[PDB]
Amino acid sequence: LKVYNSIFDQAYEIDPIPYFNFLRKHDPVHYEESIDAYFVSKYKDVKYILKNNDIFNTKTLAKRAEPVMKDRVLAQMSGQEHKSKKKAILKGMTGKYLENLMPILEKRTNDIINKHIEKKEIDIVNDFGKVFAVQSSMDLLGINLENYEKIREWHNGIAKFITSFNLNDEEIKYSLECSDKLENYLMPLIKDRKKSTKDDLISILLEYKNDENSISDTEILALSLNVLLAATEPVDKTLAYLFYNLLKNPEQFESVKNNPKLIKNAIIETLRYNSPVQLIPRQVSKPFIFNNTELQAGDTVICMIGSANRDPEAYSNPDEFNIHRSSDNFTSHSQNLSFGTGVHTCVGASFSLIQLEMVAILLLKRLKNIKLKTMEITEHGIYTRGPKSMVISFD
Numbered sequence: 280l281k282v283y284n285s286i287f288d289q290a291y292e293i294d295p296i297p298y299f300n301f302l303r304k305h306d307p308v309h310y311e312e313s314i315d316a317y318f319v320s321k322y323k324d325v326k327y328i329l330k331n332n333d334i335f336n337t338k339t340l341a342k343r344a345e346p347v348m349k350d351r352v353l354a355q356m357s358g359q360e361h362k363s364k365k366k367a368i369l370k371g372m373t374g375k376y377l378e379n380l381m382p383i384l385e386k387r388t389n390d391i392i393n394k395h396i397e398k399k400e401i402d403i404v405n406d407f408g409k410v411f412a413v414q415s416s417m418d419l420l421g422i423n424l425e426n427y428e429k430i431r432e433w434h435n436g437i438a439k440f441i442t443s444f445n446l447n448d449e450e451i452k453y454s455l456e457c458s459d460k461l462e463n464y465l466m467p468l469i470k471d472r473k474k475s476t477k478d479d480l481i482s483i484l485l486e487y488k489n490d491e492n493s494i495s496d497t498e499i500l501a502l503s504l505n506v507l508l509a510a511t512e513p514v515d516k517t518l519a520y521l522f523y524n525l526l527k528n529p530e531q532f533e534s535v536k537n538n539p540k541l542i543k544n545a546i547i548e549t550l551r552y553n554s555p556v557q558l559i560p561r562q563v564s565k566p567f568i569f570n571n572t573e574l575q576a577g578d579t580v581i582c583m584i585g586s587a588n589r590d591p592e593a594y595s596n597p598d599e600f601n602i603h604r605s606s607d608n609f610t611s612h613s614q615n616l617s618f619g620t621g622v623h624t625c626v627g628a629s630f631s632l633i634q635l636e637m638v639a640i641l642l643l644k645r646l647k648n649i650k651l652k653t654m655e656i657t658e659h660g661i662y663t664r665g666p667k668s669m670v671i672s673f674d
């Protein structure tokens with residue numbers, strides 16, 4: 280049954296759209312012998328998978344993640360523990376913790392802007408995104424920006440492990456060395472935070488109680504690592520895509536200046552159009568069949584978020600960037616899956632939208648007469664995906 284189209288083809292990472300359209304039409308559940316996994320490209324099937332945590336569980340993420348996380352991740356948890364600890368993490372980016380974090384993030388943003396304002400250009404990826412994304416996650420958890428350069432050096436090494444399938448021996452040992460180094464840095468701060476309640480997210484995980492029984496320090500490290508990896512890479516890439524997509528559509532870009540309230544819809548449409556998190560794996564727990572494709576217990580299905588968000592069955596003109604989308608104006612609009620859905624849907628969804636709006640408004644207010652200098656982007660990554668560089672000029 281030779282299927283010659285492959286996710287791992289060279290042309291896919293350059294332009295996955297022709298592969299998106301092919302799979303949804305001719306192979307919605309596509310098998311890749313390279314990693315023994317089926318790739319699900321249709322919106323209706325991805326939604327079904329993520330909303331059925333019993334048929335498609337999250338033990339695949341567990342195994343592949345344990346080496347660098349050192350303990351259990353929220354995705355490996357279920358039932359009361361998942362809810363109690365998810366709610367606990369959310370407390371760190373809501374309520375009073377949110378009101379204290381937001382001014383700091385404004386400062387993080389304005390400090391980056393002041394560094395680059397007098398050279399009349401800035402790289403939203405490499406000058407802002409890579410710096411702001413890691414400092415925001417550090418401010419959320421409660422890590423001092425003293426060592427932000429090395430936190431990034433490590434972070435990237437662990438993200439590679441998570442977002443890469445083919446990893447040789449030399450590449451794997453470095454990702455673990457990064458994990459050990461950051462564990463050596465973070466563990467003493469967890470001991471300090473235990474006695475010193477500074478009211479950050481790490482302190483929340485220490486004050487938490489599971490039937491009058493706090494969680495182990497090694498567990499707190501893994502949950503902190505899970506926040507650091509889940510919050511950094513997505514936020515960086517989304518920001519680059521946002522200003523790129525708007526500047527490539529002057530009408531919509533000017534619409535956003537005239538009505539700054541449209542910024543929330545622009546970010547949402549950006550997240551649908553250029554889904555920064557492209558893949559979500561799941562494990563099949565029992566015999567199941569989509570279309571005519573049979574899956575056996577233990578098979579691995581990989582949701583294709585970017586394809587699902589461009590399904591003609593879910594959106595009219597799905598491959599066009601249109602911030603003016605709405606469900607008021609057959610299935611012309613649907614709810615995208617950029618944050619997944621179901622039980623393991625992103626805890627930092629509301630916080631990501633809020634934080635991304637603050638940055639966009641600030642950039643638009645201080646950088647006057649924004650003009651695009653990177654006329655054509657080059658995107659990389661199939662698990663996490665974003666532009667390599669996105670430079671803009673200003674007065």
Ligand code: HEM
Binds near residue numbers: 618
């Ligand atoms: C544009 C920004 C973001 C995007 C696109 C995104 C995407 C996602 C997606 C698709 C999932 C589902 C994973 C799965 O089903 O296995 C997820 C889960 C998660 N995200 Fe995000 N994320 C973003 C920002 C953040 C932020 C700021 C945080 C801060 C802590 C965060 C923390 C988490 C956590 C802890 C989970 C696990 C949820 C669970 O297992 O119940 N993410 N995210």
